[model samples]
Target: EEGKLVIWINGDKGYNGLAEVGKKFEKDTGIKVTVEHPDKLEEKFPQVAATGDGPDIIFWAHDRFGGYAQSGLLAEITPDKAFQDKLYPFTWDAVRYNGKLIAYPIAVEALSLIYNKDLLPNPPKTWEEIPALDKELKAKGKSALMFNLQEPYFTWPLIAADGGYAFLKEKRITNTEAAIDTGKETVGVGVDNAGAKAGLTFLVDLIKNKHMNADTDYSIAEAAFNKGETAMTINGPWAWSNIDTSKVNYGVTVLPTFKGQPSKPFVGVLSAGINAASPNKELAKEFLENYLLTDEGLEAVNKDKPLGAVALKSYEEELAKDPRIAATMENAQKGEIMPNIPQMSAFWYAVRTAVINAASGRQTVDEALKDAQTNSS
Candidate 1:
């Protein structure tokens, strides 16, 4: 086991897709590669690594990279310019924290407007068109769009479209600069700002005026779209797995625009990070940089995952052959990448509670947002 390498991945369809890739890496390098599904990688990785005992590599979402990097638990691998050139430029930001590259981005995902082709032959191009569609849809006992209003992830795009953001950003001019502004100069939370208020008002009006339901949850919204009770739903590629395609003919498109601006959803990237404590650092790097990043390797990880937008530029043509991947890439091109910082956890919890309170009529839009701003701050 001197030259053996171990990798930990979550139990999901995408992780399962990597099994064959791991086998190939093992065969190519003659290094026994073990892919394990650990119960709690987030909580368990740091503790195990502190004892100088952990897997050689850990595969997970990019959002957790900041914390791991800051704790000095993850190794920094500076990929060469030639290797970097093969990936989408934005993906580099996802894997970096405190100015060091800590992981290799594998795939991209973001929410897109999935509509029933039979009901919405042509989806609305602008936010202004939605209300008009509501009228026509209501007359036919259908909804123009349905989403979980109480869920912050589903509602953030609307808030973001109107200039709301959980954290403030500053371009790094020097190594001393912070990745994001989180200080006296920082706009702690944008929920209470005028733009955010306007966005919230619009969404609330949709619910108050009976265009969309306030009580709709994820399952309900998905069911309505599947049964053709609703014309559209704002969901990510992961949602497509459970969708019964035979029951509905659907098309994926970018989220509708607001005031001529595309609604920007949060783009999440799946990536692999090397353990700083691993004795097989070189072996892990070899497996990741050579085998996993290659065209054949990426295709294996991305295969059958039509919802995933592969990060490799060489695979773009092949991915575009599937309409779903094409639409996902389109949305990702316009989407906001999720900040891979621990503070993002606080941001999500605050916004979720606030959206639920405001949409449920338990609190005024201004009141809810103000409270959210305070909590986030």
Candidate 2:
């Protein structure tokens, strides 16, 4: 007889590779794997973790655990030493914070600007080109950009493209040492507000002057773009899968740029991790090392979703078949990694509120940004 580990999963249907991995792992190791179903996971996870009643295994976004780690509510592993050589750099790096590794990264999320090749055969490279290009596209009776005013996650990339970042950089002295301020880095991605404002205005202009209906929520924006009502959008790689390719001549391109800086999307990861308080701690770590770090494990990750395996550089063969995924990762190399620091939970939310205020006309971009800076710090 073998022991079993209960695994808490966010969505079993969407993550084919992870689910299959759980089943395959059980067969190989003789460990019983139980999947937990919780209706409101956000509120339940922390309570479960706190009471030591949480599952032995959890599949979650690595970045979201920053707060857990800071609160001493999660386990810490030395992934760089224990698992780094076998994993892809980007995937492994996404789960790393300071010097401690927190999760066994499963995949790297990719983002991009999906465009209609029929209306915009060429995507603009820089911000300056976008206004003129928007005018040209609108003149042909097509809306220039399909986007929602909500979702700073979507808009921040454009801000990031223009050189805006959401966090301050602190130099790590060592694993055991406190992060030091070199007095060289500024808060938020290094982009100035002038560039951010210009990017914001471009989107607002698309809605106000170009007559695009981006004022609707995010779902509408996605549907509008897919239906050809809007010519382009800022989104991720998996987004390309839903569009009706036969109905529209579509293309994927890098985010529009400003002063040579292209929009850089936040690199996100969905990973498997061990709870510090789990009674079955050893088993949890073993599961991560054995199945999640192997070749068969990686193939499963790329099976259904365009999500890149954390173990491969950039699914080269896969990207060759899809230009959109290729363009996103290509430009992402130049993009900065969002701060995995725990302080960023509050930092990101406050920034989102500030950006939303600007988008909703509650504050000017400058006032909103300065307000964000104050709240985040």
Candidate 3:
């Protein structure tokens, strides 16, 4: 309203979405909005935050935002209660840091198994189910699923649903003075590595035994899955636009129950928060409060994005419209929202090593998880 609000985007595609939403806001409220594109924001933001001259608002992931909060760079926003109620519980829970709300969700982004049902009539519900299916497909000179073994983003979910956590969740320990903090800080997602190992080992074995192609790159995996060379793959909705499902039969589901409960991919909310040191602090907050989350305002943000906005109240109803949405919503129902603690970045990477090592047959599940805890801060 008083000063220009700068919004930073990771790419043109993201900026394009913001542009539309910005137009809607301007049309309705007459506030000036500027959209800018830059490198991977994770790298750019901290530098900006460090300079104390960062933009008024930033759109980023909850985990990434957590890093800022720990750095004391985030301006904690009091979340709208009605907005919280309109969201999937996990969505709201994930963005919180140290009991303070730090961001507002622009869309609900989630990961799930996207399938070309035309090739395989049914997709299995667990990691164990894949090998047999792979055999059947291999015998027919076909592929079962296509994935990138080197990338853990596709591998971590199997680990999480299996009762493994990468970081030690320290119970609130307190002594006479301050609470005795005993939480282990690491990059681990605490889900057991058995499912992850099993899932990966099975995948590696599938590739080694010729059940599936082991050499497929991420793009190839997407192309193959989209082209129907493979029945399915573990991925998020971002792939939906790239995968040509026009005439093919396709659907998505939570990762099959691995250890006990149903295993599902994580659903993430992308949002913005004001810079605590911004020159236009009040103005930024006003735009965020009065115009950002409004129905018309957010709808502009969601125009071409894979994620969509929902009042916490409408989360279930909006999610019910799509199978992927249902899987994500269901996953969020039982899923763990990632923590935004500073040690989380290191925690996740260490956890990745443990899980991937175990999955690649380099370590046992216990050994892998223990190594994760040992290696992480």
Higher-scoring candidate on lDDT, 1 or 3: 1
Candidate 2 local distance difference test against the native: 0.64
What number of clashing residue pairs does each candidate have, in the order they appear? Answer: 0, 7, 25
- TM-score between model 1 and native: 0.79
For candidate 3, lDDT tens digit of each residue in 105-176? 556665677777777767787766777887777676667777765655566566556544444343444455
Clashes of 3: 25
What are the per-residue Cα lDDT tens digits for candidate 2 across 220-301? 8778788887788766654655564437778877777766767667776766777777777677777677765566655564
Candidate 1, residue 117: lDDT: 89
lDDT of 1 by residue, 1-377 (tens): 25898888765434555667778877877778877878868668878876777888887778777778777889988689998998888777799887889998877887889998899998888777888898898899998999877668888877888678766443334434677544332244678888777778888888888888788998799888888899989887766755545478888888888877778777788888988888888888788878877787777665533427777878866776877877887877776788877556566778888888888888888998999888765
Off by over 4 Å in 2: 1-13, 29-44, 53-55, 59-61, 78-83, 128-142, 167-192, 210-214, 244-249, 313-322
Residue 369, candidate 3: how far off, in angstroms? 4.7
